[PDB]
């Protein structure tokens, strides 16, 4: 009823090639609750016991404690930098950060392996192929008929359950191994049957054989699916996270790294941003996003004057490509006044903040609330600009910023600059090849650009995993005007 009302009043207004994923914990923190919502689709509702493998492993408290310890040490490396700066202390500094990168990598790997397991396909953005799914249904039902003691009335599985198998990915690729994932999903199927009154004992089921036959069915699905590949769906995922789950870099889970994923405080917030989308100046999936003109942006570069490498990296590029030809406002090597900051938020389609922190030292959060409307899509390239709910990102979302890019923890200048440069190139703010005068530009959504830009960092986990975007997909409108 409430899921019915949520579907009708919120989700069915969301672009149909996007989906919304809600992540929360059960009372004791024993289960990960995942709800996938999509316009015109029945909801996926999952409750995943984190320790389910044991009775067939680390609990939430253990995982979160490990994460927070890693983050604490990462933050320490970002500021002990100045003191350590020498010539052989360099080696130790880089070694420490490499070790932390590996630690965080392994934590995310373990979360994906143990907590998500075979349900990682719930995050899949693959397009629905109704005719192929029913072919898979017939084969899979054949597997159940052959192997379940209960079939020596039959429960009929929902299509969304079958889509979890498809969502594991291309089973025909070299290196593909779905055995553990498939085992996890076969337990799920047996448990669904059990729930609806078709009962079986695990011990009487040859799961290993079902895995082989199910994998063979998936190879048949994907062989045929690959003959008509998905060209460009502009699929996007929006995460709604419960309070304890924001600190996790979900987007950097191995199975999510390639996907365009953003976060949103609430469904109410998502709905508001969608109703305020600007159309491009131009059956076109890009039309689902907000379109921000390239003209008239603002960049705030090295406002505290001490970030000389960051200034050096971008100042000439910004003068050449933004200030000179596209009427951008520039604030360089001086602090912006609060009126300047508020004016940029009000008038600029894009605001680039390349400085320390979130910029809260220059503009009060409550004045971001007083704004009749926040026009700007905002990139907060500084330490913990989206971290630790209440915070700067919260207020930009309240103000109606279409999107805000920020960091979950502290970062260092050159590596976040590599990321930022990648975002601007992918998004089309700067021409391709600028960071490596250029002309010709990409047109990824901001969310797609952020996901791709994580590749640019020396540390995918220590640096890039910090980077997240709150809001909806934003496209640059190159020839557009406000």
């Amino acid at each position: 009823l409430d899921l019915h009302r949520i579907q009708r009043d919120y989700i069915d207004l969301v672009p149909k090639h996007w989906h919304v994923i809600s992540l929360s914990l059960s009372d004791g923190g024993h289960d990960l609750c995942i709800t996938r919502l999509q316009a015109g689709q029945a909801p996926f509702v999952l409750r995943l016991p984190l320790e389910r493998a044991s009775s067939r492993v680390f609990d939430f408290h253990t995982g979160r404690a490990e994460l927070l310890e890693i983050i604490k040490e990462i933050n320490r490396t970002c500021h002990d930098s100045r003191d350590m700066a020498a010539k052989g202390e360099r080696e130790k500094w880089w070694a420490e950060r490499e070790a932390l990168d590996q630690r965080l990598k392994e934590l995310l790997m373990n979360i994906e392996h143990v907590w998500l397991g075979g349900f990682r396909g719930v995050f899949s953005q693959h397009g629905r192929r109704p005719e192929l799914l029913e072919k898979f249904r017939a084969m899979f039902e054949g597997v159940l008929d052959k192997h379940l003691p209960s079939r020596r009335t039959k429960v009929v599985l929902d299509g969304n359950v079958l889509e979890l198998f498809i969502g594991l990915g291309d089973a025909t690729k070299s290196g593909a191994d779905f055995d553990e994932e498939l085992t996890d999903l076969l337990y799920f199927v047996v448990d669904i049957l059990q729930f609806h009154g078709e009962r079986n004992a695990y011990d009487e089921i040859d799961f290993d054989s079902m895995v082989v036959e199910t994998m063979d069915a998936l190879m048949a699905y994907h062989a045929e699916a690959n003959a008509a590949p998905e060209s460009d769906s502009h699929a996007h995922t929006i995460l709604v996270l419960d309070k304890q789950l924001h600190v996790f870099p979900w987007e950097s889970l191995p199975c999510l790294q390639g996907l365009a994923v953003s976060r949103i405080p609430s469904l109410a917030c998502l709905r508001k941003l969608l109703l305020d989308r600007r159309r491009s100046s131009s059956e076109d999936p890009r039309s689902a996003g907000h379109h921000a003109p390239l003209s008239g942006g603002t960049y705030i570069l090295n406002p505290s004057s001490d970030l000389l490498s960051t200034q050096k990296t971008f100042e000439s590029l910004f003068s050449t490509h933004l200030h000179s030809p596209n009427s951008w406002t520039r604030i360089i090597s001086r602090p912006p006044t609060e009126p300047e900051f508020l004016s940029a938020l009000t008038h600029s389609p894009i605001l680039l903040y390349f400085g320390h922190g979130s910029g809260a030292q220059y503009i009060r959060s409550r004045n971001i609330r007083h704004l009749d409307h926040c026009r700007a899509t905002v990139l907060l390239m500084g330490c913990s600009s989206a971290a630790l709910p209440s915070g700067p990102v919260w207020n930009y979302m309240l103000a109606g910023a279409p999107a805000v890019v920020g960091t979950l923890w502290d970062v260092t200048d050159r590596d976040i600059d590599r990321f930022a440069g990648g975002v601007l190139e992918g998004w089309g703010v700067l021409p391709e090849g600028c960071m490596g005068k250029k002309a010709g530009r990409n047109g990824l959504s901001l969310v797609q650009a952020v996901a791709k830009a994580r590749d640019r960092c020396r540390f995918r986990y220590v640096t890039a995993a910090a980077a997240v975007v709150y809001g909806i997909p934003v496209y640059v409108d190159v020839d557009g005007k406000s």
Binding site: A86, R90, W94, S384, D413
Partner: peptide, 8 residues
């Protein structure tokens, strides 16, 4: 031997 990076 790359210079230590400066904090955000």
């Amino acid at each position: 031997d790359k210079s230590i990076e400066v904090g955000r």
